[PDB]
Design a binder for these strands. Structure first.
Ligand SMILES: [Mg+2]
Ligand SMILES: [Mg+2]
Ligand SMILES: [Mg+2]
Ligand SMILES: [Mg+2]
Ligand SMILES: [Mg+2]
Ligand SMILES: [Mg+2]
Ligand SMILES: [Mg+2]
Ligand SMILES: [Mg+2]
Ligand SMILES: [Mg+2]
Ligand SMILES: [Mg+2]
Ligand SMILES: [Mg+2]
Ligand SMILES: [Mg+2]
Ligand SMILES: [Mg+2]
Ligand SMILES: [Mg+2]
Ligand SMILES: [Mg+2]
Ligand SMILES: [Mg+2]
Ligand SMILES: [Mg+2]
Ligand SMILES: [Mg+2]
Ligand SMILES: [Mg+2]
Ligand SMILES: [Mg+2]
Ligand SMILES: [Mg+2]
Ligand SMILES: [Mg+2]
Ligand SMILES: [Mg+2]
Ligand SMILES: [Mg+2]
Ligand SMILES: [Mg+2]
Ligand SMILES: [Mg+2]
Ligand SMILES: [Mg+2]
Ligand SMILES: [Mg+2]
Ligand SMILES: [Mg+2]
Ligand SMILES: [Mg+2]
Ligand SMILES: [Mg+2]
Ligand SMILES: [Mg+2]
Ligand SMILES: [Mg+2]
Ligand SMILES: [Mg+2]
Ligand SMILES: [Mg+2]
Ligand SMILES: [Mg+2]
Ligand SMILES: [Mg+2]
Ligand SMILES: [Mg+2]
Ligand SMILES: [Mg+2]
Ligand SMILES: [Mg+2]
Ligand SMILES: [Mg+2]
Ligand SMILES: [Mg+2]
Ligand SMILES: [Mg+2]
Ligand SMILES: [Zn+2]
Lengths: 61, 213, 105, 159
RNA sequence: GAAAGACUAAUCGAACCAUCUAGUAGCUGGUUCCCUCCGAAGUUUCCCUCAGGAUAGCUGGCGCUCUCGCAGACCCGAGCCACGCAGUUUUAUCCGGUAAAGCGAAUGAUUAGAGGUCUUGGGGCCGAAACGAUCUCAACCUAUUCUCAAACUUUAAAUGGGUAAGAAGCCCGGCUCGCUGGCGUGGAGCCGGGCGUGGAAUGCGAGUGCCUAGUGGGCCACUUUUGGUAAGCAGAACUGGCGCUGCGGGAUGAACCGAACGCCGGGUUAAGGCGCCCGAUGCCGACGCUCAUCAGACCCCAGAAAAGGUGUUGGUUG
RNA sequence: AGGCCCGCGGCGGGUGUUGACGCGAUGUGAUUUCUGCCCAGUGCUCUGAAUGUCAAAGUGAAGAAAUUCAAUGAAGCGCGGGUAAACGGCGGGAGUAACUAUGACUCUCUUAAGGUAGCCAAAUGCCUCGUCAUCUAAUUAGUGACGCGCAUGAAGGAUGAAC
RNA sequence: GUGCCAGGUGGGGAGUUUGACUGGGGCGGUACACCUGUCAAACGGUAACGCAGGUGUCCUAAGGCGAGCUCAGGGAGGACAGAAACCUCCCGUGGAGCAGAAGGGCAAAAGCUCGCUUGAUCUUGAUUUUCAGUACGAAUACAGACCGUGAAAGCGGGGCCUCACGAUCCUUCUGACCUUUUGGGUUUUAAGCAGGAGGUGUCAGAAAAGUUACCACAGGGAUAACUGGCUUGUGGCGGCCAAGCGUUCAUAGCGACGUCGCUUUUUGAUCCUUCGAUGUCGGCUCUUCCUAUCAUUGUGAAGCAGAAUUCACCAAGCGUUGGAUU
RNA sequence: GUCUACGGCCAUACCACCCUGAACGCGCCCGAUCUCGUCUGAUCUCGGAAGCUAAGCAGGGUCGGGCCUGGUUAGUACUUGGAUGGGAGACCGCCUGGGAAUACCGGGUGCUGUAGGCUU
RNA sequence: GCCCGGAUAGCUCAGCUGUAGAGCAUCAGACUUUUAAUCUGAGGGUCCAGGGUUCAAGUCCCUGUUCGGGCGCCA
């Protein structure tokens, strides 16, 4: 008839058998969820980075 | 119709006071906590004797009532009706419950067993700790043996183990008997009723100059 | 609840805020030539009895009131449906409440 | 049998401290949060908008997005046997800067200064901080005073 | 069927025969050689679900991508010593409202006196006469006082939870922007350049993919803990165990204590023991306590209380 | 030209080689004596009266047609009577007589009608091993009697020889 | 009358169904979808038919903005007027109010009163909560329109926050001078695309009444009825204190208020064993055991003069009967 | 040494009463034509400058209350980990680390940013 | 969801588009030895709500609130 309802017994052991790994912190996070206005201006800046290349290389030289 | 006190001796549950959640609590057996000449001044009864539990347990209100009656009768017999003042220092604030079962030859008669087993308020008990005072008697200094005997007799109405201790405090105050006299002399203490008011050396000087006047 | 018979709200055809007449939406009559009705009639014809479930376990006591808005622009009679929360008593353009008045004795 | 309400059990978590109710002080709004800096999520209850969930109260994350009134925070949350980096939008009332990060950047700057100075002046200096070492040998003078003899006191029942 | 659901070929609350038919079964029973290696779950969510499934978790198999180098033909190193990781500490830095404590601090509960002076308090004895008076008890106020709280709290631990402890860093310049804007402003991105004392301890080689079985009845112990008089009862938290596990000890015993296991020889231990059963005190062991006409004799654990004793032994106060 | 019934089907078949002193369908159960009240409910049945609703078909109208609408209006159901030897049902609360005790009597609330004649701790009464009498030395048994009877009762009640 | 269709009647007959949880099932209840406080052991999570409660609504304002005020209560005053009608001053950290349960939050607020309004509108994504990191619901931060309000900064896409709700299929409505409607064209019709609504409360969503003692099958000791086992509330039998009873006298004999135990000859509680079966009440017969001793043997005590009786000790050797009713 | 305007932290700043205040300032104050609101020029708005520091305000005071910070309470309460420790239990002791809170007794009573004045 | 039909002094019933009436409520008076039961009179209609038709509304037509029937039922 009746039976056990809930437990977390042995659950921690199951969790730690393969380790509780943190998320893989990797360079260049995704731009998901960033403000769209800021993102579109960022895209415009990236697009127009091409101009001023001669000035950039002159300064570098 | 009361269960034996062995069924509620121990402090097994969390405190369960009579509140807006626990309703329908019957009144406690003990309603009077102070007996004897309660109006006696502080210097009238210099000797104080306490009865102190050695166990962490629950004392029932009926047990407190019985011990109070026994101690009162012995104190009235020995020291007279105006020669002592007793104070019970335990109040039955913890409600003990009962899961009432039918005492008939039938379990089919909607007994339900342990289903919905939360009980109805049976009574009230007082929780006492190790080193906590249960009763206090203040009287003349020459009635020390009578106080000890009254508390010894009252011990038999309680489940656990209790000790009788003649306190160093003056009466029911919190100040030592040896320092009490000179503190009153230098007006660090002002008597009122059965207690003393401690007068610290801070505050307005008007309160200082109403004294010494 | 009470809602006024007119409101100034966005009109998708005009593209701006316009006055709208507000009515209560009622479910229209069944077509009898809708595809599901035709399929149901074909299924029910013949022997076999009832071939689709009949609900008969009603639990809700209210419905979500649907407001039919109609733009008052003569050239734009566009209509829209707004649903409001469930209510038991709904009225259109009832007597607006006052604050400092006497309740009937 | 527990409810799944968003604010169940937050009775003291989101309550204000004693005698600190009322107007929110404005320096909290005046703080500047850039992308990439480390913030602690607290969650005061005077402001009900943009509140973090109770599982992020007391956690610490990194700001990835800044809006007019809130920030986007990447904060680690442990769920069963895995940790996942949740992204939450939290109004700036419920966050504050992380002094751990502040002290670490201060230490980095000071270490770089020491490196430059020590390369200028030749002598090598220690930068890696060490754990507490064992105590070195030392002399304890009595100053012509005999140390006090201590004995345990006799027992007596007080109260 | 003069009625019993009776009888209808030992078959009747729907005969017998063959066939559909090897009907269906979340239920019961069984399921066939050896060795080696790895090795669980009785938990989450959803389901007319609760003796079952799906789902995540735990398992195995197959790999793949990388890291330390592979050293001297005997031999012989000739500040700096791997990518990265962690059921751990340290150093910083936050988070919390339990234990405790408090109620002469709020909210509730609550004991007793004391001091004051107004009132639809009772009243008060000679006050009606302006209680000429002032005696008591109330209520009220004030300062104290006894006792409390899982659904109270000023204060507030221990244990605990998050983050950080660098090369994806730091510092110089320069460029782009339609975002922002007093401003050569702010912010973000991008491009060059220089910095290695590799910026706590300790340990360890890491990352990543596919397929996937069994399980989804659990139970026990220390501690925390809810209901119940209690239960070898019912229900939770943490860790460990049994299940899946043999071995030494507890006489005996799923769980206790020790310790985990290939087949052996020698040495030594653990827990536990050493009169005899039964290995080991067959020590010239030490100091005391105790006589029981129901003595006592070792975790769990397998039987006892209040109360007594001029039995005896210590000790305290007088 | 029927009632009741069989029948896959036939103007098929049984009752029926029959005809109301007959067939068919029920209940109760010899004789004796009785068989009370209730047609609100559910059934059954009679009447269609203007009559409400009411399918297909048919009629009219709109449309280019599919289609839509309208008018009309069979049984049945509603509306109206009858019927309990049809199924069934058949009440409470207060006060009141010159000792007390009962309550002939009086008030109200209510029903469709409030259980009548009878009978009873009965094979039907919980309380109950009811109370009284008788039978015994002693009887939770038996009989007789009583009756606010949990929950007796009239096509079945109560009796009555013979078996 | 027959043939065909239409409506009614139709347990005479047919097929099927008649939830789940559950200290066994049923009856009861909803712990079945949600929300608050606690449990809960100071991150989060955490169960019982655990405790205290609440929900299937309500609101053109109780939504939005702005402005101006301060609330509950109390003290002192004023014609009728009194304990409460209105007016005035003072104190007032909120002891009020904010729709509701509770918790949190809030004072030139989020409360009260006015003024103007409809951001409770049209859209795309991201995110949080439950979580499998699926959905629904709810929520947060943005971005693009069109607006409201205010001098403006700003604020507003419902309600101060934590609840107030619903898939596929089908239906209905709204929108695109949109797509398709089958050889082509026009027009009805129909289908589609996007967004609302009609509901599944067993709330991730079958369409559902009983009875079986005439019963059947697969199983279950996962689960009751009888023994046994744990417990001992209740039953039974004892002990401690001694206020009292006992003509006086606590304790010859009793023992209130309290309190400590024992027993498993009561009844419960539980569900560990047994459902491929342990024959289930009583009586008869027969043996043995226990002692908490009714009698008998030996004793102690009395409110034991004798007689009778009562209390207690050693003590289970021996005995403890014949009958009416059931 | 102070003030004014705008503030940050938000009582060491609050509350009660008392004393002092030079110069600027801030105020109280005077009036209602205009602007604007009222039952009321009381508030709000507006136009002023006769008088006053009485009040606000600032500074100081009080064996002041509160608040802040210490000591005590107290290595107490409580607590991580350990034992084939004690005890019939209830509970308690020890080892290993951590460690509170009242009452009671002290000290203190705003600091400061920007801009602009006054103070011989 | 569809087709009908009723709402009127306290009650019941009628009812114009050009006068809300009748019998019973209730009450004051007139009698009769008390009574009767018969009049004189007072007191009442929200003519169920709204809109439109309206010189003329309870009245005519629609939209709303209940009450009765008979239909029909794929989320
Ligand atoms: Mg399970
Ligand atoms: Mg408990
Ligand atoms: Mg039968
Ligand atoms: Mg078969
Ligand atoms: Mg099985
Ligand atoms: Mg808590
Ligand atoms: Mg506590
Ligand atoms: Mg308090
Ligand atoms: Mg258990
Ligand atoms: Mg169990
Ligand atoms: Mg197994
Ligand atoms: Mg294992
Ligand atoms: Mg093992
Ligand atoms: Mg062994
Ligand atoms: Mg043993
Ligand atoms: Mg060996
Ligand atoms: Mg041995
Ligand atoms: Mg030997
Ligand atoms: Mg016959
Ligand atoms: Mg009859
Ligand atoms: Mg008809
Ligand atoms: Mg008749
Ligand atoms: Mg009768
Ligand atoms: Mg009878
Ligand atoms: Mg009988
Ligand atoms: Mg006989
Ligand atoms: Mg008889
Ligand atoms: Mg008679
Ligand atoms: Mg059938
Ligand atoms: Mg915890
Ligand atoms: Mg928690
Ligand atoms: Mg405002
Ligand atoms: Mg917008
Ligand atoms: Mg909101
Ligand atoms: Mg569900
Ligand atoms: Mg079992
Ligand atoms: Mg008992
Ligand atoms: Mg006496
Ligand atoms: Mg057998
Ligand atoms: Mg047998
Ligand atoms: Mg004996
Ligand atoms: Mg002070
Ligand atoms: Mg310690
Ligand atoms: Zn429009």
């Amino acid at each position: 008839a009746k039976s056990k309802n809930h437990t977390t017994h042995n659950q921690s052991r199951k969790w730690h058998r393969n380790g509780i790994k943190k998320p893989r912190s990797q360079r260049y996070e995704s731009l998901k969820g960033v403000d769209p206005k800021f993102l579109r201006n960022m895209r415009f800046a990236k697009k127009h980075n091409k101009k001023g290349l001669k000035k950039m290389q002159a300064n570098n030289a | 119709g009361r269960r034996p006190a062995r069924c509620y001796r121990y402090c097994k549950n969390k405190p369960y006071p009579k509140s807006r959640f626990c309703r329908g609590v019957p009144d406690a057996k003990i309603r009077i906590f102070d007996l004897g000449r309660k109006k006696a001044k502080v210097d009238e009864f210099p000797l104080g004797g306490h009865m102190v539990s050695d166990e962490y347990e629950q004392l029932s209100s009926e047990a407190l009532e019985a011990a109070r009656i026994c101690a009162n009768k012995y104190m009235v017999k020995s020291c007279g009706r105006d020669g002592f003042h007793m104070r019970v220092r335990l109040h039955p604030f913890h409600v003990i419950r009962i899961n009432k079962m039918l005492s008939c030859a039938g379990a089919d008669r909607l007994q339900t067993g342990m289903r919905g087993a939360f009980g109805k308020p049976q009574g009230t008990v007082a929780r006492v700790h190790i080193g906590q005072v249960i009763m206090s008697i203040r009287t003349k200094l020459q009635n020390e043996e009578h106080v000890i005997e009254a508390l010894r007799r009252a011990k038999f109405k309680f489940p656990g183990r209790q000790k009788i201790h003649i306190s160093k405090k003056w009466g029911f105050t919190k100040f030592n008997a040896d320092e009490f006299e000179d503190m009153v002399a230098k007006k660090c203490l002002i008597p009122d009723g059965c207690g003393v008011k401690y007068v610290p050396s801070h505050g307005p000087l008007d309160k200082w100059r109403v004294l010494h006047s | 609840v009470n809602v006024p018979k007119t409101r100034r709200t966005f009109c998708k055809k005009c593209g701006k805020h316009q006055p709208h007449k507000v009515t209560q939406y009622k479910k229209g009559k069944d077509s009898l030539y809708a595809q599901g009705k035709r399929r149901y009639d074909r299924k029910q014809s013949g022997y076999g009895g009832q071939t689709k479930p009949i609900f008969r376990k009603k639990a809700k006591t209210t419905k979500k009131i649907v407001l039919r808005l109609e733009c008052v622009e003569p050239n734009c009679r566009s209509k829209r449906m707004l649903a409001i929360k469930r209510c038991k008593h709904f009225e259109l353009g009832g007597d607006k409440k006052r604050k400092g008045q006497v309740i009937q004795f | 049998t527990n409810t799944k309400g968003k604010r169940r059990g937050t009775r003291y978590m989101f309550s204000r401290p004693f005698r600190k109710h009322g107007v929110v002080p404005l320096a909290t709004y005046m703080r500047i949060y850039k992308k990439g800096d480390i913030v602690d999520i607290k969650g005061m209850g005077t402001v009900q908008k943009g509140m973090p969930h109770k599982c992020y109260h007391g956690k610490t994350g990194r700001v990835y997005n800044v809006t007019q009134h809130a920030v986007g925070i990447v904060v680690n949350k442990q769920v069963k046997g895995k940790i996942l980096a949740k992204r939450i939008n939290v109004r700036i009332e419920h966050i504050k800067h992380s002094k751990s990060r502040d002290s670490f950047l201060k230490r980095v700057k000071e270490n770089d200064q020491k490196k430059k100075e020590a390369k200028e002046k030749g002598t090598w200096v220690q930068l890696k901080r060490q754990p507490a070492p064992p105590r070195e040998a030392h002399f304890v003078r009595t100053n012509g005073k005999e140390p006090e003899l201590l004995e345990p006191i006799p027992y007596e029942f007080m109260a």
